[PDB]
Design an enzyme around this catalytic site. Structure first.
Site, PDB file in Angstrom:
ATOM      1  N   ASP A 162      -2.984 -11.756  10.258  1.00 57.47           N
ATOM      2  CA  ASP A 162      -2.965 -10.888   9.083  1.00 57.47           C
ATOM      3  C   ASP A 162      -1.678 -10.982   8.275  1.00 57.47           C
ATOM      4  OD1 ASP A 162      -5.488  -9.873  10.012  1.00 57.47           O
ATOM      5  OD2 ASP A 162      -4.381  -8.496  11.315  1.00 57.47           O
ATOM      6  N   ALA A 163      -0.933 -12.077   8.387  1.00 63.44           N
ATOM      7  CA  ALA A 163       0.192 -12.297   7.493  1.00 63.44           C
ATOM      8  C   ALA A 163      -0.277 -13.014   6.230  1.00 63.44           C
ATOM      9  CB  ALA A 163       1.286 -13.104   8.188  1.00 63.44           C
TER      10      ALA A 163
END
Ligand SMILES: [Mg+2]
Ligand SMILES: [Zn+2]
Ligand SMILES: [Zn+2]
Lengths: 76, 65, 390, 48, 194, 54, 243, 449, 75, 97
Positions: free
Chosen positions: G198-199
């Site tokens: 989720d970066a």
């Protein structure tokens, strides 16, 4: 009786756990280019936390250079 | 609060074309035809003019000196 | 090489191995030797490698296995569900599962929320469906209200009236004259009128205005046949053997019922196995229950931590809970118990008794601020002083 | 709209989304932590 | 940064423009997201909004996205094909480093994103020695007063589970609070130093 | 032979001794830290500290 | 209940009165108290909605208002008690003789922040909840008065933009006058290891051109307190003498 | 994975030991490469996740080939100290040399590793059975014979050369890792660390320069599949209606021990679950291996088949606490249904997919479903924390003595041999005290060589 | 029926004086430091034992095929 | 002021205070629940007058006898007894009421 009970009481709030010095907290971001046993540290944190080291015959020059660098250059 | 000078993606200067677009689109002319006339081919620029909202005009009423 | 030579070699230099290891090594070597021709040196080297792996796999002295076991049990507990399944499926009985079941087992509740037993039939009736049904009929227990198709508290003449259902009769091969016979045998001075799917009760006391309903319920709640406490029963087939699952629990009486295989019957109530079969059977039951509960959720936990927990609980000859009224309450250190719960009561009780804390544990030493006696905290070092550099 | 119950207890019956909530309380806008299901927001059609 | 479909994250890297891949129609992404969170999160609405944003920006007018009466997906897919793009929303891009086109067509669109008030500039915090509380003589609490981080009892249990006794004593005594007292061994009471 | 607890304890004692002024029993590259000096002495096998076992 | 309904719709009594009957227990309940939560609905009579096209035209032209529609017996508010006796259809094209009411706008059952998410029915419920919760944390031109505001904390997005894909409710509620985000050209691609778990990865040039650039505000306060006995504080340059 | 951390705003603390003994303890006991194997189940806890597994599959899949520049660049990026490329696997038209993914991956494995197993991509058991037979008949098959029977579902490595199979979560993923588990045990922690770094970097480069994405068309089913799904849904709804009609006239058979209403509910739920599984059966079969979402799901990198069948075909029944929705008005959940309606749709069965969109009633039912999960996690965290605290306080001070026994601080013996066999679970071969098969096999391959 | 035939019940036997003393010496433990078994336990009745006695238990654990556990009888 | 400001809050010592709406049980409502723990049936009402709240309950135990709970009363009184205390002493009056 209140001081000695509860999660915020003496036994569980100031004896079994407490706030400590030489600690830092910030968010994390991914970095796949470093080895698994390495952590990236901000330069701002590195110049704030310190590791006391004793002067010996095999590390005198490096410590002298760091002392010359002062508290503002990164390796100081 | 005011129209940006260049498109965020490609960098083409579109700061001067906002008022012209607003006037022509208000007059009745088709928005896509107006955009094509202005020369904004890539939709990265067209987004900046289509989605912009003018908000400088309602904050000017409060002054701080 | 011959199998006898292999057997001698295994016990010759692999004498230190655990027994299951020595048997498994022999079985595997026998299996492999026929497919691939093995030389004497190869067998010797294989045995040496197994011994070396066992030696390097042993636990390091000073390891704090207790905290590791506690964490290895607690950590998966954040992944289990709470709503379980809540489905019947005919062949299954609803029982609590997931985290609440683990909490029940660890706290060792005297009476579980959903008692259940697994009854194995003896060799007779084990494989026959009808005979298994007959054995279940012997085990299954019911009262008068269950058999009733309807109930009538007639008030004009003050007589209890019961309407009877054929299905409750046919579930067990029971018939109405049998119910009537048990009714007459278990009570006196009651009418117990025999009618087609109807029965009327009207003693002298219930004939008047005051003693109808209260005595009516007492009659309504009597059991004519069946084992006490076993509300329901279900029969299903596992592999090629039929087994019986039951609602409620009475482990004491089931082992005496004919047709039951007493060597293989279990119950989910630990405090029953402890009283009937002893403390070690209770320990084994606790281990199996925890293993099954965590396995049903798909989580993988090594058996060794569960063995540690079970052995810690079953230590004083009873089944103590893990918590305030159990293992934690049995700790000799005053400060260890005080830091857990109800600190003031423990402190004042220790003041009364003049208890002495020897600081032999971990929590007390952490409180003082001196090294704990685990891991590197138990190692002692010495050196020869006249050290000369090389 | 805030329920006056205690946050720490499970309260499985009170935290659930009742069928009558249709058109009176938003089904999605709720807090994340211990206040989930106990703090709720009026829908747009709602009138008091 | 978080979209309005519940997808949130932090900036992992800031890339120079010439390293970013570019579509063969002349578009450079403003943001790149991992395709791995999409199937697990099951936020198809974000994928539909990605198409809708580019369709709106290309046709010159906004797209209605009302809950149950918004413009259907099939209309937007046909309209995108009408404008000259592919109906799947996939474009051919060239790698920004090697200068050659990627093997697979890449889904690219326009998505509304929001900057949250959780900025690292307000969360970073480090304490060397700081001041101490009056009563317990331990580090203060919070960033505002140069406080120290909490070392919870669970951390102590973790340390015990690792068997590091000297690390535990170092963390629990010198960094927080320690002192010397006079004890009379005859009666156990703490003696007085004048 | 050695448990990791014993190894850690021995290295921790040697590093503290070296830092407090004890001479190093093996040549080391310049600029090294005392902990690394103790670790070097260890893997080189020159350890003057023995462990008591019952 | 029919008699009371007729008066309530005609206008003989106040609209806040709600009446419902329970057949099984033979009880009639009349509610007129404070604090009930109700929703408006179109009254359906004999399979024909009471709302007609010319009523919509009059509302559009400004001749007829919502309160007039309430008083004209076209729309009535239903609390929970009265809704027990109702049978509401979802859409105008599925209304039949059995129905007693018609839903005004099904999309309006959502809350205010939850209405921001476009196409909310295509996302799983937890994700919609997270998005609705996070919509209250983003930066933007919250109020045009921010410059002279004395809030403890504040923020200001430099170039807020109207969402290209939006719900028609947000324009009505006035959100578009105070937007809190920007439109990004997003590509779904595993560019490197720097966007896993989720970066996200952002362009430097766009940041330098004014993308997501923000300003942070914080207000400090200082009083010149007057103590008992006449002693008081004072604003001045501290002399080196003072402790 | 050990920290259970994701980069969505998480904050993590850092501590600096101040004394030499504390630094030595941290350096020797607490190094990350020491804790590759989890003590809970004797399996790896540190391993490749998501893009690592996906890139491994992309690299080692059948048909993957790379050019000179790609091979050199990826090897340099991974950090491999190679100074001479191996022989090309095949020659492209125009005379360009090409290297297969197997050859490139084999350069990271230890020179003498040998192992075979079955991965999650196994779909035709006959192919795996043939390879198993060939390996069983002679413990060293001819590589040119294996390469004729190579199949992606069966991994087999011969002296460090990858001859069959594809990378999967079983290769080095934390839960099912075997290559990493073998390496960490047979070659020490440092070699495992080097291998892990190299494979992570190599897979990241592969996934970066090959291109990997998902889009709105990843769930675009053909028309026949939609017709089949609608047929299944209609059949299920008709069956439920027939069951309800039978119940309403007392013709239903009461299942043992249950009330008639409960029997009806259980039968309805069984029918609906069967219907959803049947829809998923065709939804899976129409989306082939070429879809990136299917690649992400099958390899175990992210998600599972349930997500795909919910996004493409059917959401299915929504329930709270194991029973159908009932918490509405008297006899009905929403005022938009007639009272007393027991039909599937009126009680929570959602017939739409996330792609096709949800009607308002379906949306409300789905929100009802999600709220239960939210509150379940919220309560479960606290309950688990309290139980763990009780366990920790109960079992804190037990330790292994020098004689092997586990003793209470008061001297009471708890166990006469820790774990009754004396083997640390962390050092155990996945629960087993020792893996006899692996030792025998590796010894035979070492000596027969 | 005897409880020793049940799968949950391992084999119990009574240690005489010699093995009792040898066990106490090999672990360097007093008699008070052993796990306790109640005199009211059914196995104690069936086998026959008195307080102060030591029972040897042969367990059938999965980790090791045979394991020996010892308990001291107490009322 | 901002014209978009909706108002509806308070300003106390320079800080903006907003009163959220509490969600209570409907006053003067007879709600009936099952006390399965003691096998009883309970009806509860919350009577409001001048802000004061009084939880008054009437219950039927296993004996089939009704008892009434009143605030500031230590133990539940007999239902017929408390009804008698409110006049209406006739038994037929009880049966009709
Ligand atoms: Mg996180
Ligand atoms: Zn542009
Ligand atoms: Zn003294």
């Amino acid at each position: 009786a209140q001081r000695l009970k509860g999660k915020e009481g003496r036994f569980r709030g100031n004896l079994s756990g407490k706030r400590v010095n030489f600690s830092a907290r910030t968010v994390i971001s991914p970095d796949p280019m470093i080895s698994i046993n390495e952590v990236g540290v901000p330069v701002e944190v590195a110049m704030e936390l310190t590791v006391p080291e004793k002067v010996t015959e095999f590390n005198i020059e490096r410590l002298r250079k760091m002392v010359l660098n002062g508290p503002d250059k990164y390796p100081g | 609060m005011i129209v940006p000078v260049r498109c965020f993606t490609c960098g083409k200067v579109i700061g001067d074309k906002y008022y012209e677009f607003k006037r022509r689109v208000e007059a009745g002319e088709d928005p896509e035809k107006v955009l094509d006339d202005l020369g904004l081919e890539r939709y990265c620029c067209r987004r900046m003019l289509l989605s912009h909202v003018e908000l400088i005009d309602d904050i000017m009423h409060y002054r701080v000196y | 090489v011959s199998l006898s030579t292999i057997k001698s070699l295994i016990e010759k230099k692999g004498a230190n191995l655990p027994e299951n290891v020595k048997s498994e090594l022999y079985e595997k070597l026998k299996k492999y030797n026929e497919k691939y021709k093995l030389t004497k040196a190869e067998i010797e080297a294989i045995i040496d490698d197994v011994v070396k792996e066992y030696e390097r796999a042993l636990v390091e002295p000073g390891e704090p296995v207790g905290t590791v076991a506690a964490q290895s049990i607690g950590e998966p507990s954040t992944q289990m569900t709470l709503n379980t399944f809540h489905y019947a499926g005919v062949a299954e009985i609803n029982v609590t599962l997931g985290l609440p079941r683990i909490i029940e087992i660890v706290d060792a509740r005297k009476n579980p929320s959903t008692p259940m037993m697994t009854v194995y039939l003896d060799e007779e009736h084990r494989y026959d469906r009808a005979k298994a049904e007959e054995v279940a009929r012997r085990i299954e227990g019911t009262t008068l209200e269950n058999l009733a198709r309807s109930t009538t508290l007639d008030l004009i003449n003050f007589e209890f009236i019961v309407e009877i259902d054929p299905e409750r009769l046919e579930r067990s091969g029971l018939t109405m004259e049998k119910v009537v016979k048990k009714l007459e045998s278990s009570f006196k001075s009651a009418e117990f009128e025999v009618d087609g799917y109807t029965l009327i009760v009207r003693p002298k006391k219930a004939d008047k205005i005051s003693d109808l309903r209260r005595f009516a319920e007492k009659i309504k709640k009597h059991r004519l046949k069946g084992l006490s406490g076993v509300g329901k029963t279900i029969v299903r087939k596992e592999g090629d053997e039929y087994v019986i699952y039951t609602e409620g629990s009475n482990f004491k009486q089931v082992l005496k019922v004919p047709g039951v295989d007493p060597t293989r019957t279990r119950t989910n109530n630990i405090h029953e196995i402890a009283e009937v079969l002893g403390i070690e059977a209770a320990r084994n039951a606790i281990i199996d229950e925890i293993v099954s509960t965590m396995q049903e959720q798909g989580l993988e936990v090594d058996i060794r931590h569960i063995m540690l927990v079970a052995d810690m609980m079953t230590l004083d000859g009873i089944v103590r809970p893990i918590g305030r009224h159990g293992v934690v309450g049995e700790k000799s250190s005053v400060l260890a118990r005080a830091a857990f719960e109800i600190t003031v009561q423990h402190l004042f009780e220790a003041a009364e008794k003049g208890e002495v804390d020897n600081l032999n544990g971990v929590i007390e030493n952490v409180l003082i601020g001196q090294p704990v006696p685990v891991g590197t905290g138990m190692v002692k070092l010495t050196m020869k002083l006249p050290l000369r550099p090389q | 709209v805030t329920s006056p119950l205690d946050r720490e207890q499970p309260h499985f019956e009170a935290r659930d989304l009742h069928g009558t909530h249709w058109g009176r309380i938003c089904p999605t806008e709720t807090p994340e932590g211990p206040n989930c299901g106990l703090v709720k927001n009026l829908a747009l059609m709602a009138q008091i | 940064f978080a979209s309005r479909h519940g997808q949130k994250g932090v900036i992992g890297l800031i890339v120079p423009q010439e390293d970013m891949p570019w579509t063969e129609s002349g578009i450079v992404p403003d943001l790149i997201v991992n395709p791995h969170g999409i199937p697990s999160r099951m936020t198809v609405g974000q994928l539909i909004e990605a198409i809708g944003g580019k369709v709106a920006s290309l046709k010159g007018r906004r797209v209605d996205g009302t809950a149950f009466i918004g413009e259907p997906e099939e209309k937007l897919r046909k309209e995108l094909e009408e404008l000259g793009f592919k109906h799947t929303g996939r474009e051919i891009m060239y790698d920004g480093i090697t200068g050659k086109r990627l093997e697979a067509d890449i889904f690219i669109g326009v998505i509304y994103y929001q900057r949250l008030h959780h900025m690292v500039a307000d969360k970073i915090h480090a304490r060397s020695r700081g001041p101490v509380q009056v009563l317990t003589k331990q580090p203060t609490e919070g960033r505002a007063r140069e406080g120290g981080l909490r070392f919870g009892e669970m951390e102590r249990d973790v340390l015990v589970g690792h068997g590091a006794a000297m690390l535990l004593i170092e963390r629990l005594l010198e960094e927080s609070d320690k002192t010397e007292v006079w004890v009379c061994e005859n009666c156990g009471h703490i003696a007085l130093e004048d | 032979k050695y448990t990791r607890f014993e190894k850690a304890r021995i290295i921790g004692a040697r590093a503290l001794q070296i830092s407090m002024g004890a001479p190093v029993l093996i040549d080391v590259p310049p600029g090294i830290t005392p902990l690394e000096a103790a670790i070097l002495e260890f893997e080189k096998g020159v350890i003057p500290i023995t462990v008591i076992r019952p | 209940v029919q008699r009371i309904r007729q008066d309530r719709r005609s206008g003989k009594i106040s609209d806040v009165i709600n009446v419902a009957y329970y057949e099984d227990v033979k009880e009639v309940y009349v509610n007129s108290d404070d604090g009930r939560v109700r929703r408006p609905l179109i009254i359906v009579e004999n399979g024909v909605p009471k709302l007609t096209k010319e009523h919509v035209q009059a509302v559009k032209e400004g001749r007829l208002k919502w309160s007039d529609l309430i008083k004209m017996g076209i729309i009535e508010y239903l609390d929970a008690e009265e809704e027990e006796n109702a049978y509401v259809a979802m859409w105008p094209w599925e209304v039949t003789e059995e129905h007693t009411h018609l839903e005004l706008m099904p999309a309006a059952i959502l809350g205010l922040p939850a209405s921001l998410v476009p196409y909310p029915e295509h996302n799983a419920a937890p994700r919609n909840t997270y998005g609705a919760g996070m919509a209250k944390q983003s930066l933007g031109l919250g109020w045009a008065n921010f410059r002279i505001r004395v809030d403890t904390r504040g923020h200001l997005l430099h170039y807020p933009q109207i969402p290209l894909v939006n719900s028609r409710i947000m324009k009505a509620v006035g959100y578009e006058d105070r937007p809190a985000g920007q439109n990004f050209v997003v590509a779904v691609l595993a560019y490197q290891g720097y966007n896993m778990e989720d970066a996200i990865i952002i362009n430097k040039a766009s940041i330098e051109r004014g993308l997501a650039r923000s300003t942070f505000f914080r207000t400090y306060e200082a009083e010149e307190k007057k103590y008992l006995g006449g002693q008081t504080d004072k604003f001045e340059i501290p002399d080196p003498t003072v402790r | 994975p050990p920290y259970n951390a994701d980069f969505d705003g998480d904050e993590m603390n850092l501590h600096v030991p101040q004394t030499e003994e504390a630094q030595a303890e941290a350096r020797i006991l607490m190094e990350v490469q020491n804790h590759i194997i989890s003590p809970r189940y004797g399996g790896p806890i540190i391993g490749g996740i998501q893009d690592h597994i996906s890139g491994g599959y992309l690299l080692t899949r059948e048909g993957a080939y790379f050019t000179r520049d790609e091979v050199e660049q990826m090897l340099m990026f991974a950090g491999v100290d190679i100074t001479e490329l191996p022989e090309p696997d095949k020659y492209d038209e125009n005379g360009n040399p090409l290297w297969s993914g197997k050859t490139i991956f084999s350069l990271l494995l230890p020179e003498d590793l040998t192992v075979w197993y079955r991965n999650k991509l196994c779909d035709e058991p006959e192919r795996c059975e043939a390879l198993e037979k060939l390996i069983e008949e002679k413990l060293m098959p001819d590589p040119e014979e294996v390469r004729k029977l190579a199949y992606d579902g069966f991994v087999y490595i011969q002296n460090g050369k990858l001859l069959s199979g594809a990378i999967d979560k079983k290769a080095y993923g934390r839960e099912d890792g075997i290559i990493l588990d073998l390496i960490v045990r047979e070659y020490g922690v440092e070699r495992a660390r080097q291998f892990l770094d190299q494979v992570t970097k190599l897979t990241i480069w592969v996934i970066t320069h090959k291109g990997f994405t998902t889009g709105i068309d990843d769930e675009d089913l053909p028309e026949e599949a939609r017709d089949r799904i609608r047929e299944i849904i209609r059949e299920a709804e008709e069956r439920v209606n027939k069951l309800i009609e039978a119940y309403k006239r007392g013709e239903l058979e009461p299942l043992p021990g249950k009330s008639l209403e409960d029997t009806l509910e259980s039968l309805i739920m069984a029918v609906l679950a069967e219907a959803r599984d049947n829809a998923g059966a065709v939804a899976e079969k129409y989306l082939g291996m070429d879809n990136h979402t299917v690649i992400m799901a099958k390899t175990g990198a992210r998600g599972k088949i349930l997500n795909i069948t919910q996004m493409a075909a059917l959401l299915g029944q929504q329930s709270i606490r194991g029973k159908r929705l009932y918490r509405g008005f008297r006899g009905r959940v929403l005022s938009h249904f007639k009272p007393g309606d027991l039909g599937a749709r009126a009680k929570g069965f959602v017939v739409n997919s996330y792609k096709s969109g949800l009607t308002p009633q379906e949306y409300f039912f789905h929100a009802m479903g999600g709220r239960e999960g939210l509150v379940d996690t919220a309560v479960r965290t606290a309950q688990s924390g309290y139980m763990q605290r009780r366990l920790i306080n109960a079992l804190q001070d037990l330790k292994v003595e020098y004689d092997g026994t586990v003793r209470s601080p008061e001297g009471i013996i708890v166990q006469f041999k820790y774990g009754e066999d004396g083997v640390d679970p962390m050092k155990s071969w996945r629960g087993k005290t020792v893996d006899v098969d692996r030792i025998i096999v590796r010894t035979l391959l070492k000596m027969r060589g | 029926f005897s409880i020793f035939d049940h799968v949950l019940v391992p084999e119990h036997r009574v240690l005489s004086e010699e093995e009792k003393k040898a066990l106490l010496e090999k672990y360097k433990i007093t008699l008070a430091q052993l796990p306790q078994i109640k005199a009211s336990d059914p196995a104690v009745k069936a086998l026959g034992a008195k307080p102060g006695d030591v029972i040897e238990i042969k367990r059938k654990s999965p980790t090791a095929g045979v394991y020996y556990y010892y308990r001291v009888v107490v009322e | 002021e901002d014209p978009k400001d909706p108002g509806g809050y308070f300003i106390i010592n320079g800080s903006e205070r907003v009163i959220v709406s509490i969600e209570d049980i409907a006053p003067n409502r007879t709600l009936v629940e099952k006390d399965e723990r003691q096998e009883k049936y309970i009806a509860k009402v919350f009577s409001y007058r001048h802000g004061y709240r009084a939880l008054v309950a009437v219950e039927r135990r296993k004996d089939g006898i009704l008892y009434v709970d009143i605030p500031n009363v230590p133990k539940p009184v007999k239902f017929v007894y408390v009804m008698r205390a409110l006049g209406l002493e006739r038994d037929k009056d009880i049966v009709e009421a």
